[PDB]
Design a protein around this nucleic acid. Structure first.
Ligand SMILES: [Mg+2]
Ligand SMILES: [Mg+2]
Ligand SMILES: [Mg+2]
Ligand SMILES: [Mg+2]
Ligand SMILES: [Mg+2]
Ligand SMILES: [Mg+2]
Ligand SMILES: [Mg+2]
Ligand SMILES: [Mg+2]
Ligand SMILES: [Mg+2]
Ligand SMILES: [Mg+2]
Ligand SMILES: [Mg+2]
Ligand SMILES: [Mg+2]
Ligand SMILES: [Mg+2]
Ligand SMILES: [Mg+2]
Ligand SMILES: [Mg+2]
Ligand SMILES: [Mg+2]
Ligand SMILES: [Mg+2]
Ligand SMILES: [Mg+2]
Ligand SMILES: [Mg+2]
Ligand SMILES: [Mg+2]
Ligand SMILES: [Mg+2]
Ligand SMILES: [Mg+2]
Ligand SMILES: [Mg+2]
Ligand SMILES: [Mg+2]
Ligand SMILES: [Mg+2]
Ligand SMILES: [Mg+2]
Ligand SMILES: [Mg+2]
Ligand SMILES: [Mg+2]
Lengths: 149, 77
RNA sequence: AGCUUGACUGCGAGCGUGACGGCGCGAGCAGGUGCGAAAGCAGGUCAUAGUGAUCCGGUGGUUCUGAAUGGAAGGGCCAUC
RNA sequence: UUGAGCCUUGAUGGAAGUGUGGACGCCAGUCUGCAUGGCUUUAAUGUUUGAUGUUCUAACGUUGACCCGUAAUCCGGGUUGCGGACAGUGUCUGGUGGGUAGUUUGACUGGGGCGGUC
RNA sequence: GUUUAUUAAAAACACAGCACUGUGCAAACACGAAAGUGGACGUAUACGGUGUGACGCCUGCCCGGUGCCGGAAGGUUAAU
RNA sequence: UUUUGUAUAAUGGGUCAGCGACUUAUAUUCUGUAGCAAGGUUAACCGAAUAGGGGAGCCGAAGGGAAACCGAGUCUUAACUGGGCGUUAAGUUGCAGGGUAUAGACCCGAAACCCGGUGAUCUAGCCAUGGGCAGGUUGAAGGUUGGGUAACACUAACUGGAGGACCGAACCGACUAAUGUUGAAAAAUUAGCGGAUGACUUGUGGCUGGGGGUGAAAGGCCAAUCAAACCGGGAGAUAGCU
RNA sequence: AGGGUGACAGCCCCGUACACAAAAAUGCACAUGCUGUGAGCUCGAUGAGUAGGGCGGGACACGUGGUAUCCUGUCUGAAUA
RNA sequence: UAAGGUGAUAUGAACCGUUAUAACCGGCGAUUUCCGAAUGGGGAAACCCAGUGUGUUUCGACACACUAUCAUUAACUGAAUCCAUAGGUUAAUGAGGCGAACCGGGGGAACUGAAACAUCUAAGUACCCCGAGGAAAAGAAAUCAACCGAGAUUCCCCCAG
C-alpha cells in the first residue's frame, strides 16, 4: 500500500508526494475520506504528469516578459519631472501618485504607492535608478529629469 | 455460507496427519470478515462479506471494479 | 622370559551340520609380515556359550551409476555403525 | 518516555584584566562552557529504526435508546450512546483433552489361571 | 413417593434438609459446524454441577500421593 | 459324519419327488496333442470379414557382472594353482487338461462394522387443552365467648376445616399363593394385597431420533427385541470354525 | 426364413425373395429467401494479487523422500521478448 | 383400408354396415373432471374456503376467466434524508416438477487385506448432494523429445506387472 496524497496529511502529507503507508490507515481513513489514492501506476503518471505540466510548465509560462522592461532599455521621455526644492537642494516629496508624472505616458497608466525604499528618500542631484515594484522578481530602469520653471 | 464474495473462497477439506501420520477429515476455511467499504461512486457503505485477501484484492483492483463484478456476475451487494 | 602383531588381505581342494536362512572345519595357493640358526610355527585365546535376520538410516572409501549435456543430488559396490 | 544508528552544532584523534556550574580530573593540573572590556572514547536537537505507556477513532463489537422500510420482539439502512485496535474469528502452533474414536493387551501349560518358562 | 412393562418393590432411586463448588448476566451450563435456542422474560435470598440425605447429639487427626487452586524469580520449552 | 476308536447311550436324517455345491474370466507354468522350427506368433485395427492384411510387439536363439562393461565367456582378486555362474538338451503358437495368481473362487452359516433412510399409534420425559376420585374418619392454624392475669402468658367450651393424614369402592398399581405352562391368555385368571386430594389418575393433540433420545437410575424405555431400534444398502463383510 | 391349419405342407392360409406407396406431420441432408451475424488487409496490443515463495493439506503410479510437476486454506509476492 | 362390425372376462340385447363418413389402421386437430410441481388461500392428496373482473324477456345469485413463488427487463410509484438509494404495485418473458443408464462436479465410509494392528488397503468404492448433454468431459502446447525431431483432446493395442 503505497498510494499518493491529496491534502497535506500529518507525518507524511504533501499535496501529492509519494508515500508508503500501512494498508489500514489507507483503506479505513485516508482514501474513502478524500486524502489519498492507491498508487495504481496509472496514477503515478496521472499525478506525475502534473509534476511536469506545471512545475516545469507554468513555472516557465511565467517567463514571457523578461524583466518586464523589454524595449524600455533606453530610459523614457521626460514629460515633466518629480519636483525639487530648497533653492538648490531638495524639499518636496512624492505624493501617493507622483513618480509617474515623468514616466507618465509610457507603458500603462496606474496610480498606486507600492513603496520600496523605506527611507527619507535621498535629496540630491535627481536622476536615480533603484528598481520599484514591477513584480515579485524582476525590475526596471529609467531616470528623472527636473523642471526649470 | 462461509464464502468470500470477492474471490469465491469457500471452505475446503483435508486431513490431519498425526506424528503417527493418522488421517482425520477436517476443513480449512477462509479468513472471512465482512467489512464496511466506502464507495463515493455511490455515496454509501456497501458492506461486503470478505476474506482478507479479498480485501487485498479490492485494495489493488479497486472497489468500483470489484463491485463492477458481482453486479456483472449477478450477485447482490 | 625375549622379540613381536598371523587377532594379516585376497582365496580355498575337500568335508561336517542344517527344511531353509545359515553355522563349522580345512590343507593348499598369491601378496605381505613376526618369531626361529634351521626344520618350521602363526588367518587369535584347550575346545565347545558370550547373541539379533531384513528394512530404514549414518560414516569412510570407490566416477560403477547419474532421466537433454557437463556436473551434482540420489543409487550401487567395499568397509563399518 | 525509551535501547540503538545517521545530520549536525559545543569535547578526545578579533587581547589581557574586574566575574560563574559540571569534572575520568597522573596526587593536588587544568579545564568545558557560562559574563564581560579600550572513520573513534563525549551533551542536546532534527531525525531513521524497535520496545513500553498514555490517549485518539476510523476497522471491529454492542443481547442501550431512537428513526424509517413496516401496524413487524426477525432482518436491513440511518442517528445516537457505550466500547474500541481490545474483543472475536481464519491459518499456524505448544499444552490440556476416556468427552469421543480406532485398536492392543503373546505363547507354552497334564483344563484355565497363579507360579514358572521362552 | 420411584423402580427392573415380562423371574428382583428392596435395605436400591427420589425426597425435604446440609455442605462443597461454579456463575456479574451476551451468566455459568446445555442443544447446536452456525444462525438460533433453553437457563429466564430469572439476576447471587438467583441459576448450574457434585456429594450427603428428616430430626436429635455430633462430625477428630493426615496435604506424602492423586486431584483441584494460587505464584510477575529462575531452569526447560512451539510455530515464528 | 467325526474320530486313536462308534451297534454305540456321540452328529444328521419322519418318508417321497423336485432343486442343491470345485465354476467363470484373465494371466501363468507344466503334461498331452497339433502346426511350424532357429524360429514361432501376431494385438489393436483394416477387411475382400472364421480368408486375407496388419509383425506394433512378445517369447526363443548368450551369458557373466551390482554396474560401466566384457562376451562363449564373464565375475571375483593385484593375480589366481583357482573358485562362482555360464558355453555341451529347441523353440514358439494354438487346443484339451493338471496346479497357481487376481476375482465371492466348492456351497450354506455368524455375532458384527459403515452409509442413507423409517419409527414417540407401545413405552420414558415434557408441552397445551379437557376429564375423574362412592362412602366413612381424624379435627391443624385462625376466630368468638367465658374463666384468667396489673397486662400479656395461660386455660375451657365452641366455632373453623388443615393434611404427599386415616379406613374404603371407582380408578392407578402389582406384594403372596394356587391355576395355567402344545394356556382362555407370546405375562393372564382366581383369592388375598398397595395407593386412592396427590410427587394422583386419565382422553385428545403436540415435541425429543439411534452413539441419539428419554430415564425419582433398572443399562430401564424408545411398536411382543435394546450394553446401542427398525428398513434398505455396502453385501456373496469376514469365518485358519462346523 | 418362419408361423398356422384335425399328425411333419416350397405349391391350403399369413408370409418370405423381389418390386411398390403418403393427404397429412415430422428427421436429415443439401439448393435458396428472412432476421441476423461477422468476413479480408494494414498498424497495434499479448491475460498481477498472477508466477514464485513460508506454513498446513491435497493431487500426480511416487506414503517428504534427495522430490521435480500440479491444486490452494493461510501469509506474502516478481519480471514484462 | 375394407365386407364386415359396437376392446376383454362374456354371452345376450339393441343396433351399424356391405363401393364408400360401418368398423379397423396411421397423420393433424377438438375435448381432456379432480388430486398431483399444483402455482388464488388452505389442507389429513383427489377436499375446504376466497378476492377481483365479467355474464341472465326470472341480471337475487349461481356459472366462466384471472390472481403462487422466484429471476431478468420495463413502466408507474416511493422512506429514514431533500437529491438519491432502499422499499411498493403492475406488466412481458422465463424457471419450477418428473425420469433408465451413461457424464461433470461438491462431500465421502466401513467391513475387509496386511493372516493381530495404527502408516498402508479396501477406495475416491458404496452412498448423499448439485448440474448438464445426446453424449458429457477434454482440447490447439509456457506439451514432449534430446542436439534428430514431434506437434491439440478423446479412445484402442503395446511398452510392462
Ligand atoms: Mg475407548
Ligand atoms: Mg494359551
Ligand atoms: Mg411405600
Ligand atoms: Mg419385574
Ligand atoms: Mg415383583
Ligand atoms: Mg442448587
Ligand atoms: Mg446415600
Ligand atoms: Mg445413612
Ligand atoms: Mg471429616
Ligand atoms: Mg472322542
Ligand atoms: Mg464295532
Ligand atoms: Mg445314534
Ligand atoms: Mg401421546
Ligand atoms: Mg392420604
Ligand atoms: Mg385406602
Ligand atoms: Mg386380583
Ligand atoms: Mg448392574
Ligand atoms: Mg420392546
Ligand atoms: Mg441392519
Ligand atoms: Mg455370508
Ligand atoms: Mg465389500
Ligand atoms: Mg500470452
Ligand atoms: Mg389450489
Ligand atoms: Mg398449496
Ligand atoms: Mg477394523
Ligand atoms: Mg486385518
Ligand atoms: Mg462440450
Ligand atoms: Mg527444433
Amino acid at each position: 500500500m503505497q498510494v499518493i496524497l491529496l491534502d497535506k496529511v500529518a507525518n507524511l502529507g504533501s499535496l501529492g508526494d509519494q508515500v508508503n503507508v500501512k494498508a489500514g490507515y489507507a483503506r479505513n481513513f485516508l482514501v474513502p475520506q478524500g486524502k489519498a489514492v492507491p498508487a495504481t501506476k496509472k496514477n503515478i503518471e496521472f499525478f506525475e504528469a502534473r509534476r511536469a505540466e506545471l512545475e516545469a510548465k507554468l513555472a516557465e509560462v511565467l517567463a514571457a516578459a523578461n524583466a518586464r522592461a523589454e524595449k524600455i532599455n533606453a530610459l523614457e521621455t521626460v514629460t515633466i519631472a518629480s519636483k525639487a526644492g530648497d533653492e538648490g537642494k531638495l524639499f518636496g516629496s512624492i505624493g501617493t501618485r507622483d513618480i509617474a508624472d515623468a514616466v507618465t505616458a509610457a507603458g500603462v497608466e496606474v496610480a498606486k504607492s507600492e513603496v520600496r525604499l523605506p527611507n527619507g528618500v535621498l535629496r540630491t542631484t535627481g536622476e536615480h535608478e533603484v528598481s520599484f515594484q514591477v513584480h515579485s522578481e524582476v525590475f526596471a530602469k529609467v531616470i528623472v529629469n527636473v523642471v526649470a520653471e | 455460507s462461509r464464502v468470500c464474495q470477492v474471490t469465491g473462497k469457500r471452505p475446503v477439506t483435508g486431513n490431519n496427519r498425526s506424528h503417527a501420520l493418522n488421517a482425520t477429515k477436517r476443513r480449512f476455511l477462509p479468513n472471512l470478515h465482512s467489512h464496511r467499504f466506502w464507495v463515493e461512486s455511490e455515496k454509501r457503505f456497501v458492506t461486503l462479506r470478505v476474506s482478507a485477501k479479498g480485501m487485498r484484492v479490492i485494495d489493488k483492483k479497486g472497489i468500483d471494479t470489484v463491485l463492477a463484478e458481482l453486479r456483472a456476475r449477478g450477485e447482490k451487494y
